[PDB]
Write a structure and sequence with these properties.
It is found in: Cytoplasm. GO terms for molecular function: 3-phosphoshikimate 1-carboxyvinyltransferase activity. By secondary structure, the chain is an alpha/beta fold. Helix content is about 35%, strand content about 20%. It is built from 14 helices and 23 strands. The strands form 6 sheets. Strands 2-15-17-16 form a 4-stranded mixed β-sheet. A 4-stranded mixed β-sheet has the order 4-5-3-14. The chain has a 4-stranded mixed β-sheet with strand order 6-7-9-8. The radius of gyration is 23 Å and the shape is elongated. The protein binds sodium ion. The site of sodium ion (NA) has 5 residues, from loops.
Length: about 425
């Protein structure tokens, strides 16, 4: 039933390896597969996330004939795409396999069936139409569909709403180096404000030496060529990393996160700015980031438009500021429209534990005040669960209602969190 959040009555002192980003893990797996398939060599992936979804990707690559080896977050990909008879790739809840793997199957010379199990889910017929437009011999308007590999994918130019289909656009860009004519993707909107997943993809392609030109607004062009075999050092995912750094901040202790990049495409700078304003010590060394928390801090006003995903951890920091302190978190009105309304959730849960959190047109106003034991609801949301864990470091008797909200995303979280404390 409930998960007792461990308390840190003395400062935490810990070195933690935070698992890698799911997005980067799946991107690296595809780029490693393509390099191997092209005969460019075996690649290694260090820091890979191991979860149900990344296991499904690993299985899909092995179905295509690639050799996958490793242990935990350390993987090697090698061999060739040679699927053989009756090859079938399970996709299921990993909408990622469906979007990233069909182009790779098209490089083989046999049929590969993609299957999974609703009426109320997102239709994939348009995805299949786009694959056909680029030269994939695929028949279906849904699952199951069969890519009939004939050793090449022509490529060309496709128009798509890259905001609505950003994962599919990433999938096409990942494999585009192998298309005969390359790929041009034209976004059909006149503006595209935030496309972090497409930008991550483009940055990773450049790390693999692929010629990608994204200099024109709303357009991405990849030229055909080899994908380099690399040592892919996957960056800790920023959201999860911040939960661990927040434990240093609230406990007044030290957390050192290993395998941190010299420069990151994730918005690490923005959160480090906030931590610096709470007077935490922040040291960016060799291949690690260390944060040491202060004995306490007062309230802060921060606009989180650029790092909306960090709202629950930041709200936890605000609730643990010196009593009486007022914090205003703004730039997050838009978050109300996401599947999970974390503003309503955060206000309810802080208030359930004896706190003071007010919803506002642009965000949350939190008054730090002493809290009491209770059941912190996660609402089946991993970020909400980590926020309760942060609160629990300082408040004895906080229990997160169901930690499965986090373990489905980050299986290692409860054990790594307990080892840290
Ligand atoms: Na209280």
């Amino acid at each position: 039933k409930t998960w007792p959040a461990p308390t840190a009555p003395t400062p935490v002192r810990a070195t933690v390896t935070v698992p890698g980003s799911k997005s980067q893990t799946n991107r690296a797996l595809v780029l490693a597969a393509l390099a191997a398939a092209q005969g460019r060599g075996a690649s290694t992936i260090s820091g890979a996330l191991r979860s149900r979804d990344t296991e499904l990707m690993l299985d899909a690559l092995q179905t295509l004939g690639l050799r996958v080896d490793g242990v935990g977050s350390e993987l090697t990909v090698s061999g060739r795409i040679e699927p053989g008879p009756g090859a079938r790739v399970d996709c299921g809840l990993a909408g990622t396999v469906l979007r990233f793997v069909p182009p790779l199957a098209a490089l083989g010379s046999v049929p590969v069936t993609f299957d999974g199990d609703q009426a109320r889910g997102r239709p994939i017929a348009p995805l299949l139409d786009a694959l056909r437009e680029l030269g994939v011999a695929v028949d279906g308007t849904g699952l199951p569909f069969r890519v009939r590999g004939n050793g090449s994918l022509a490529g060309g130019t496709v128009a798509i709403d890259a905001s609505a289909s950003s994962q599919f656009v990433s999938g096409l860009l990942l494999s585009a180096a192998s298309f005969t004519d390359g790929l041009t993707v034209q976004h059909t909107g006149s503006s595209l404000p935030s496309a972090p997943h497409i930008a991550m993809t483009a940055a990773m392609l450049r790390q693999a030496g692929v010629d990608i030109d994204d200099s024109t607004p709303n357009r991405w062009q990849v030229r055909p060529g080899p994908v380099a075999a690399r040592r892919w050092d996957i960056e800790p995912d920023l959201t999860n990393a911040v939960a661990f750094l927040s434990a240093a901040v609230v406990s007044g202790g030290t957390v050192r996160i290993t395998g941190w990049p010299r420069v990151s495409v994730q918005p690490a700078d923005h959160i480090l700015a906030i931590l610096r304003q709470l007077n935490a010590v922040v040291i960016h060394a060799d291949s690690s980031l260390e944060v040491r928390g202060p004995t306490g801090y007062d309230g802060f006003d921060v606009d989180l438009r650029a790092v909306g995903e960090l709202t629950p951890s930041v709200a936890a920091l605000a609730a643990l500021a010196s009593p009486g302190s007022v914090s205003r978190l703004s730039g997050i009105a838009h978050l109300r429209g996401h599947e999970t309304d974390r503003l309503a959730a955060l206000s309810t849960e802080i208030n359930r534990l004896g706190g003071t959190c007010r919803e506002t047109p642009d965000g949350l106003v939190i008054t730090a005040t002493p809290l009491r034991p209770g059941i912190w609801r996660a609402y089946a949301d991993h970020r909400m669960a980590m926020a309760g864990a942060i609160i629990g470091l300082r408040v004895a008797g906080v229990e997160v209602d169901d930690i499965a909200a986090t373990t489905k995303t980050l299986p290692e979280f409860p054990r790594l969190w307990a080892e840290m404390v």
